[PDB]
Design a protein around this ligand. Structure first.
Ligand code: EAE
Length: 338
């Protein structure tokens, strides 16, 4: 794929590659001049030539045709697909050019968090966008900062020699949601494993079945990461992850522990976890009850953390819906009408 995504390459006799936007296991997204839309810059996702990502790209195209025609103005902030084509056996999906990922913005600023005013506007828009999927019988299943993008390059950046990086300052925080390659319809077959480790709901880890609510969990994990500049689930291990959940959120409901087939993780009705091992004291140091992550006691910080706690409810049957999230007091500030 190296061989077909260089600067100056022309795709479908119109898209001149100018830059790389993002890469991953799916393939590459490249910025192109479209010489047949008056020189408009667009994004083109060149999908890896592997059955998994070919199948995923066919699924994404069908999802985007549905969401795009259901919501032609993009009121619910899903990325607009322009068309798709084939380039040397690769599916290429053309989209409207968006800005930076929320992931790159935080990361390149040295893992410095978004301002609370920005998080409020971003959480609302993320909740509206994904609630739109929920209304149309879809679960995204892979919500993470990489897949939430600023609509625009609406920031300033200045080289700071003291820390030897550019710092970016957000002017406007408007986002869209990308990557519908995993999105699953209610009636379709449900993968066992879904989501990126740090963003995975407990009902996924425990293979108890999943729906819309696994998206709500992922959004909760996104919002705390936006507030802190890093994840509270920094792990590469499901058992460790569950141990971190116990220390941050309190103990798992017995019913979920007793029902799961993933019994390697447990012993009788507790996590099979050596608290007193090296690794166990490590997790205890990295972990404290959620509300202790709060950077202020100020009521608008309390309002965010109450929404985060409801999104990170263990029982997906009890977990807040995005319909209800959109009505949470944290968003009252956006509906100020004197
Ligand atoms: C690379 C992020 N990205 C996507 C990623 C996936 C997995 O789909 S889709 C997309 C569309 C526009 C864009 O503009 C900047 C970026 C963009």
């Amino acid at each position: 794929m190296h061989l077909i995504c260089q600067s100056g390459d022309v795709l479908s006799a119109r898209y001149e590659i100018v830059d790389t936007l993002g890469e991953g296991a799916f393939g590459k997204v490249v910025e192109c001049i479209d010489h047949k839309a008056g020189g408009r810059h667009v994004a083109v996702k060149i999908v890896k030539n592997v059955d998994r990502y070919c199948e995923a790209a066919r699924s994404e195209i069908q999802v985007l045709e549905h969401l795009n025609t259901t919501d032609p103005n993009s009121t619910f902030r899903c990325v607009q697909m322009l068309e798709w084509f084939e380039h040397h056996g690769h599916i290429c999906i053309v989209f409207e050019l968006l800005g930076l990922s929320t992931y790159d913005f935080i990361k390149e600023n040295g893992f410095l968090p978004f301002r609370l005013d920005h998080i409020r506007k971003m959480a609302y828009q993320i909740c509206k966008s994904v609630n739109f999927l929920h209304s149309n019988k879809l679960t995204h299943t892979d919500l993470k900062p990489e897949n939430i993008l600023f609509v625009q390059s609406d920031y300033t950046e200045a080289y700071n020699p003291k820390i030897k990086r550019d710092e970016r300052t957000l002017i406007n925080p408007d986002i869209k949601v990308v990557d519908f390659g995993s999105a699953t319809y209610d009636d379709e077959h449900h993968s066992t494993l879904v989501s990126t480790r740090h963003y995975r709901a407990p009902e996924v880890i425990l293979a108890l079945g999943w729906s819309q609510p696994c998206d709500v969990w992922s959004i909760g994990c996104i919002l705390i990461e936006y507030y802190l500049g890093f994840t509270v689930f920094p792990t590469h291990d499901s058992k460790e992850h569950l141990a971190m959940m116990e220390r941050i959120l309190g103990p798992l409901p017995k019913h979920m522990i007793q029902k799961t087939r993933k019994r390697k993780y447990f012993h009788h009705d507790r996590l099979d976890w050596d608290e007193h091992s090296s690794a166990g004291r490590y997790v205890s140091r990295a972990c404290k009850p959620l509300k202790e992550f709060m950077l202020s006691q100020d009521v608008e910080h309390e309002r965010l953390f109450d929404l985060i706690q409801k999104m990170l409810e263990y029982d997906p049957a009890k977990r807040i819906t995005l319909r209800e999230a959109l009505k949470h007091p944290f968003f009252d500030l956006l509906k100020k009408s004197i």
